[PDB]
Ligand binder design. Structure first.
Ligand code: HDD
Ligand code: HDD
Ligand code: HDD
Ligand SMILES: [Ca+2]
Ligand SMILES: [Ca+2]
Ligand SMILES: [Ca+2]
Lengths: 672, 318, 674
């Protein structure tokens, strides 16, 4: 692996300059003990110059994110559908690197901002690097790549004051969405629980565009990539996401780091929907349109293999910050389609690496290197790390015997464009009329959510749109929402003091689709990694005993247990001062601690109660183990996902079912 | 003030950067459902621009916000310094100020606990003069060569880049406890000074001892102190945490709003002035950036008024 | 091969992208056979993007140059004078890379421009990379680093029209020289044959600055580096250098390449003059002043070891273009002095690599990497190639157990500043009055040249000053020259139709110094690699027979023989159309070819012109076979002239001719001022 070879060990030895001269780096060289620093101090300048040049431009989008190493394993020989080598044999393993991210925020912004999320996967295959640069949402805002800076300018902070950070909750964003109706589908997804996933591990990945699988005989089929989480689907609630942003901006990256470190590496089934070329317009929309999904009712999923992330990076900057993905990193057996969003991305990802790397040799960075030999006539450029031995780097040549040789469909396993692809017609800057329905699939999505899920989405829109200053934009927004659903427009209008326009049923329908709802997706298939906060006290030795007993039981089931008390000591992980409900998926009070829930210089006033109360209000499983606490917290004893048992074993058993259920949605008020 | 460089786009047709009228909403394709063409220069120039919009954030003080203003001298200070911007009662000099946190990246929250920057440029009639200060009068370390050590220790751990904009982790406290010079700035950062209510409610300090030099060549030792006219005020920690979540832009919004509403913030630009002979007279060394001169030992002299009263037009450019 | 680990082989295999996907690169993807090219053509864009970004900024100075790898071998354990590890044992070997260069010209300018020449050497030592960034002339133009851009702006092309390329022969340069008299010493060197060396192999290297050698016990001595060539000293004549610039811009790089490829790698003795700290002002000038040499009569040379270059690079861009030297690459046992020219260089060479490399990780390029482990807390930056395991990169730390440990005089073989060094006094922007004599040493140099050597220098000045348009500048030039030597001012004044100012004898003297003259340095100690052109003809099978016999006899002694005729065939290397006298160190006509001395195959009079040019430029010339008077008469070359040969016997001809190649130049063929 190119990465082992470039590892640098500093666990022993004397400090050296970058050219291996032993040095010191703690005091400047001066003329006299109280004198001016000398220009000849090379130790100073080499160290400070390095520091001064540490930073590189952040990614133009998806600047906030985190990565991990893993493996992809093919389930079968898939030669019957694609010539791709990484898919050509049962059990074939390929190393991977994945980076997850938000989209709009700058590199220090919070993980739990409401946003589309990136899910970019590099497969280091034996016939070159293959990247699938996806999102956690299957559709994108716009239909043509040339509109990308319009979209991004509108959602990023306003350019006079650079407010607001990492948020669509401002005039410009909603102005763009309301003027550009293609945005409706992705907007609906972003306003759902999909905008605030519980973790990178509890979301899916989508290639978004239709691509082609191409067989060695030249035939092709159309595909959509879907990475199905083995951890299940789960979201935050909004108020929780907001608190999290403040209490732990690093929530997702920590969640992934910890899951991997504890031997709970996340998994996805890497799947495709596969359909014939003849079906490009068969399903009621155009498969070239990146704002549309193929409902699973029309094309089921084929499971191709297992993606598992199981190793953290050694140096974040060198690996995570410098990884440079491209949809242009394609391999034989896969091809592009004429999706005008995909088309333009091909250009952007090659060009933008020049900005980030500051030079053209970015593919030589260890994380970007392939795991096979490189033979080409690319030469020179700033930061050239190779010494090329071929002194005739031109084709055609006789002086290097005609090497490197041309690879194509019939030689050297070359990439080839699907030979069935054609073009015809005028050279046009025109949008296909087949792209014009911007509203029916947003409605399909909305219809497919549970009542409380639909309420959460309406409430997200109420929240954001209420922050838009312009009365004109707000009205334009209601016009568009109304073409999706009159009821949505009515309910959103209610919060902002305007009347919705009259129903316009052109695009209304009652159809639903499977697999897009989080709440309706069932209990979580595993509870390993989930976090349980046990609120205790140092004043009662019984309280600490109960805590310890729970811990033993819960930990054996893979749960991460944090015992909270007034001060740290043996068995206590976290003080009340640093504790918050956003740090737990479930909260248990050991009854020996009832006193705290009724002032201390050791934590803010009413902190122990507030944690319990927040956990309840946000729908989490909560319990008392040993019930006037429940009175103090105004939590009904009989409520769903509320537990009260003196039996350690009985409580653990029931509470573990609550963690699987994950959220108790009956605690949230609904419109009429 | 920067009027000559402003570009107005409130009217007119879209052009390339070389003034050729164009469109930028649809790619040029071989047929209405066809592939995009390489000859589409409208597409490539627009997307290349976008692909290259970002520059490296500042290595420290990445997160911050600025405004334009005016400095007015209270006197002719010729008798202590030849500095031209200080040479007449009432003399006005344009300024630009940027305030910041220190450790966090771009996009991190204004209300993280941290040292804050207070960097002031005076566009003087004998050249630009910058005072690059902090809201805390003393720094962590006594030698510039140690800066990367301090900064590596307080920035996120380099394997996982956790935690953002916070000293609340092992590496930072390891450094603090192994490098006892850090104690003074540490105590300031751990006070309300680490979580100010706004940029307008904090002071600015040059930190270092500098020199004022007269035209005759005689000099005195000085410490810069910008004294807020808005008063001093802090958040409480629990509030600062919630705020970091509800409004990462709290401080920049506060400053922007006070300026728009005609309540531009003001500071008295002051110095402590002492003799060269007093470099070691106060029980410490004036060359030591971890020390203050107690005001009991040298009173503040008010040199002039700094007022910020105009927001930038384009945040990136300014 | 030192950099084997980084080599990429493309002698087999299928074309791939940079990420290993097999592709083609010969036809663009188009919508239809006569259609437009598609944006989705990633094969096209990756290939053309790479090409579009191949260039990096050339070096701000010394842009034109050439490099090679080699070895340094120590002659002793030098612990008695220095702690330097690479000098700590007899026979100890250290890999080196050397780059040679001109100074003023851009990339693509001619090797044989009149200029100062760079001689930069990297020692990849077992205690870090050590660079000696030197020139072929022992003194520099200016006395303070801050004046470097003024010097360089003045000698580089005028900035309105960028004219003239790689030349001091214009108003601005001579304006600077005449207003900044410190320039005189290096100017006199550059106007001598040292400005136009015969090859990189026939010039010496100088560190220029006084440095310190520092022992493990902390005591120090002042040193000057002198790399003395084992090939001898040799120059071109000016007219020859001018024609060469046009006929073969690559003359020096080709010469170096060829010498290495033929197993004739060039060698230098790496030497120092060593003197005590107490002698900084003992020799009549200040050792901190880089416009002064220590005459050999006051301090002899110690030979430290042998430098040999014996391996050409594999990829010129990767190795020669990307090598980034710094006088800041110093090792324990060596230290700086307060030479204000040296002091400023320390800053510049670290900073300038950011420009060339475009990022802070230039030390990671294979050619710049050390040959020992690196342990420090430098992190990130564009192009970061390492993956650092230590997640606590700060000092002091406990979380990585206090590692890396601080290195200093007492622990870990750290660099340390010579502990006897001090500073005292006001903080000043003032020039030391010890630097004030700008003229005595130029006069010492001029005095040490032979009469014909002094003529060559005067003629170089007459050439360049005649091209200065401003009469004021020309008058200011004569003012400075006259302070060095009235005779020089008079003789230069004569060419430009001005009068020399009256003698001003303040700095006149008659002292001389050894080892600075080229023309007086004796016959070359070896003639291997020297070039012999045999002018022949295809008309006569006897001419080609003589040429073959001669070739055999000359090649036996390691000479590089080129047989020239009207057209190529077996045994003929070059046509007259491509041949020129500048291509040879010696020229022989075979008497079978006498008739040649009009064809569509070469310009009118070419064969004769080659012989005549060779003669006029001082080269050994002859006729082999026994019949000589026809050729020699046609050429106007006297048969009894020194360095003119005529013998029937091949063996006898070659023995005489070989003496002439060693003598190298016959200086009696040049007129002297009377
Ligand atoms: C034409 C411009 C353009 C368009 C239309 C898109 N993107 Fe993009 N994307 C970029 C231009 C770009 C970029 C500016 O080129 C970035 C920034 C840094 C980089 O390497 O590429 C990028 C970054 C980027 C990343 C971060 C990769 C990483 O972790 O480093 C992801 C996951 C995506 N994008 C995903 C998408 C998806 C799912 C899209 C719609 C289907 C999409 N992008 C459309
Ligand atoms: C030797 C390194 C070093 C040391 C010891 C310091 N700094 Fe610094 N500082 C930098 C190196 C630096 C820098 C890396 O050069 C920055 C980052 C971006 C820039 O322009 O300079 C910087 C940025 C920077 C900014 C942001 C200016 C802006 O808004 O653009 C402020 C306010 C300060 N610093 C203030 C200080 C104070 C009050 C210090 C202690 C007296 C201090 N710095 C010590
Ligand atoms: C303060 C500026 C400055 C001063 C006073 C000098 N130089 Fe220099 N030199 C540079 C600034 C510089 C530079 C701009 O930094 C270069 C350009 C490329 C590089 O790496 O350094 C350079 C290049 C350079 C090279 C080419 C190295 C190579 O082959 O890559 C040589 C041989 C020298 N110089 C030698 C000298 C000598 C013998 C000097 C007088 C004693 C001298 N320089 C003074
Ligand atoms: Ca806005
Ligand atoms: Ca840490
Ligand atoms: Ca000129």
């Amino acid at each position: 692996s190119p990465l082992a070879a470039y590892e640098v060990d500093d666990s022993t030895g004397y400090l050296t300059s970058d050219v291996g001269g032993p040095i010191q780096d703690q005091t400047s060289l001066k003329a006299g003990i109280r004198g001016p620093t000398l220009l000849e101090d090379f130790m100073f300048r080499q160290k400070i110059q390095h520091f001064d040049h540490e930073r590189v431009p952040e990614r133009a989008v998806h600047a906030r994110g985190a990565g991990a190493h893993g493996t992809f394993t093919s389930y079968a020989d898939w030669s019957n559908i694609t010539a791709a080598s990484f898919l050509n044999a049962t059990g074939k393993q390929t190393p991977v690197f994945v980076r997850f991210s938000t989209a709009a925020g700058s590199r220090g912004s919070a993980d739990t901002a409401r946003d589309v999320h990136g899910f970019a996967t590099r497969f280091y295959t034996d016939e070159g690097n293959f990247d699938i640069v996806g999102n956690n949402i299957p559709v994108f805002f716009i239909q043509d790549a040339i509109q990308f800076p319009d979209l991004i300018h509108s959602v990023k902070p306003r350019p006079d004051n650079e407010i607001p950070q990492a948020a669509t909750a401002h005039d410009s964003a909603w102005d763009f969405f309301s003027q550009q109706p293609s945005t409706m589908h992705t907007l609906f997804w972003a306003m759902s629980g999909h905008g605030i996933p519980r973790s990178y591990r509890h979301m899916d990945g989508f290639g978004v565009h239709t691509f082609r699988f191409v067989k060695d005989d030249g035939s092709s089929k159309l595909i959509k990539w879907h990475f199905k989480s083995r951890q299940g689907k789960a979201s935050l609630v909004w108020e929780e996401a907001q608190v999290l942003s403040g209490k732990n901006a690093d929530f997702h990256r920590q969640d992934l780091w910890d899951a991997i470190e504890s031997g709970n590496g996340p998994e996805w089934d890497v799947c495709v929907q596969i359909v014939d070329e003849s079906q490009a317009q068969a399903f009621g929309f155009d498969l070239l349109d990146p704002t549309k999904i193929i409902p699973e009712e029309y094309a089921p999923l084929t499971k191709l293999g297992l993606l598992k992330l199981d190793r953290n990076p050694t140096n974040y900057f060198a690996e995570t910050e410098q990884v440079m993905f491209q949809p242009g990193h394609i391999v034989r057996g896969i091809d592009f389609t004429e999706d005008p969003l995909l088309q333009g991305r091909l250009f952007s990802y090659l060009d933008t690496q020049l900005n980030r790397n500051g030079g053209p040799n970015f593919e030589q960075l260890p994380i970007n290197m392939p795991r096979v030999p490189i033979h080409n006539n690319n030469r020179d450029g700033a930061g050239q790390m190779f010494i090329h031995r071929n002194k005739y780097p031109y084709t055609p040549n006789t002086l290097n015997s005609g090497y490197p040789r041309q690879a194509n469909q019939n030689a050297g396993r070359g990439f080839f464009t699907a030979p069935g692809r054609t073009a015809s017609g005028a050279l046009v800057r025109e949008v296909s009329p087949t792209f014009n329905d911007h509203w029916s699939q947003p409605r399909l999505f909305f219809n497919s959510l549970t009542p409380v899920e639909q309420q959460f989405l309406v409430n997200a829109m109420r929240f954001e749109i209420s922050l838009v200053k312009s009365e004109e934009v707000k009205k334009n927004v209601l016009t568009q929402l109304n073409r999706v659903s009159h009821d949505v427009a009515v309910r959103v209008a209610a919060a902002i003091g305007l009347g919705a326009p009259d129903a316009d049923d052109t695009y209304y329908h009652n159809n639903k689709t499977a697999g897009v709802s989080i709440v309706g997706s069932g209990p979580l298939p595993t509870i390993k990694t989930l976090r349980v906060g046990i609120l205790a006290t140092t004043s009662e030795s019984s309280a600490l005993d109960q805590a310890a007993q729970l811990r033993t039981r819960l930990e054996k089931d893979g749960l991460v247990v944090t015992v909270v008390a007034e001060t740290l000591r043996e068995g206590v992980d976290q003080t009340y001062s640093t504790a918050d409900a956003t740090g737990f998926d479930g909260v248990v009070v050991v009854d020996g601690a009832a006193a705290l829930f009724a002032s201390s210089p050791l934590f803010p006033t009413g902190r122990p109660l507030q944690i319990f109360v927040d956990a309840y209000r946000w729908g989490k499983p909560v319990g008392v183990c040993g019930s006037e606490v429940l009175d103090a917290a105004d939590v009904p004893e009989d409520g769903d996902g509320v537990y009260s048992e003196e039996s350690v074993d009985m409580f653990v058993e029931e509470f573990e079912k609550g963690l699987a259920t994950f959220r108790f949605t009956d605690r949230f008020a609904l419109d009429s």
